């Protein structure tokens, strides 16, 4: 009887550990209900073992540079210190999940490939991946919208790195 609320896209939640076989599908979902059903039955990012990643990517996109919708793409990086693990990490990740599945980037939502959270000893990272790092308009808008939704002061500056640059410096800042 109950009618689920469909999302604009099919999404896939992945888990990664350091040394294809290293990367595991957690679940896919295409409704608001099936998302919350997933979120409430998986471990928080703050409780993950160091050197492990969660990633949400649109259906058919592998969360890797060499994927053809990521190859010419880049990422908006958020860098967290050791103290922010308890206060901001889990909150900033859910805000990123909701941003993506909510199609919150107006004309430029199709540029978004997915988002990644890195759980590291030195300092945690959250990134939204887009598809074309030379698209100033699309990348700049997605950056401004993202920075607002996280609630960061204007003085705090975030950078956008090409995946080609990272595989060895930002292309944009906002």
């Amino acid at each position: 009887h109950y009618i689920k609320h469909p999302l604009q896209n099919r999404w896939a939640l992945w888990f990664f550990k350091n040394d294809q076989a290293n990367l595991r599908l957690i679940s896919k979902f295409d409704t608001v209900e099936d998302f919350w059903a997933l979120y409430n039955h998986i471990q928080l990012s703050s409780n993950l073992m160091p050197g492990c990643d969660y990633s949400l990517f649109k259906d058919g996109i592998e969360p890797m540079w060499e994927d053809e919708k990521n190859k010419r793409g880049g990422r908006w990086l958020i860098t967290l210190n050791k103290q922010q693990r308890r206060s901001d990490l889990d909150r900033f990740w859910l805000e990123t999940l909701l941003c993506l599945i909510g199609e919150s980037f107006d004309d430029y939502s199709d540029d978004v490939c997915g988002a990644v959270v890195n759980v590291r000893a030195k300092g945690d990272k959250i990134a939204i991946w887009t598809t074309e790092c030379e698209n100033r308009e699309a990348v700049t808008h997605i950056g401004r919208v993202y920075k607002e939704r996280l609630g960061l002061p204007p003085k705090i500056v975030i950078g956008y790195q090409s995946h080609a640059d990272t595989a060895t410096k930002n292309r944009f800042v906002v």
Binding site: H1, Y2, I3, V32, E33, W36, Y39, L94, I101
Partner: protein
């Protein structure tokens, strides 16, 4: 359990008229959480109306409906109601009951609905139509 939110009581009223909306909820007790009325005006975004926490009977209303609208509950029947008076074009919309997701219930309902809209609710009904003319 087999969750359900069924809204009804909606219809056509003249300007200044009054209606009572109902929502029969199944699969979870209304005293376990807070239930939200929200409306969608023709070709415009989701708007928070009123909240009820039947456990304490505490309520809050959007500034747009303060003085005119009353949220209530029959805890024995697991049903929430919205009494509406002095209706006008402003209030013409489909009316939904929804439960805000667990992870977001720390934030106010005005914020959840303005920022996340439909994706803020882990459950929400198909709604009942209210037209004012």
């Amino acid at each position: 359990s087999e969750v359900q939110l069924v809204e009804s009581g909606g219809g056509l009223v003249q300007p200044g008229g009054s209606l009572r909306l109902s929502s029969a909820i199944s699969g979870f007790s209304i005293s376990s959480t807070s239930i939200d009325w929200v409306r969608q005006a023709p070709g415009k975004g989701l708007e928070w109306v009123a909240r009820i926490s039947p456990s304490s009977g505490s309520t809050s209303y959007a500034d747009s409906v303060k003085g005119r609208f009353t949220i209530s509950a029959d805890t024995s029947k697991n049903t929430v109601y919205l009494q509406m008076n002095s209706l006008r074009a402003e209030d013409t919309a489909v009316y939904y009951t929804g439960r805000v997701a667990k992870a977001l219930n720390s934030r106010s309902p005005s914020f959840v609905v303005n920022t996340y809209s439909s994706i803020g609710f882990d459950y929400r009904g198909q709604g009942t139509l209210v037209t004012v003319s």
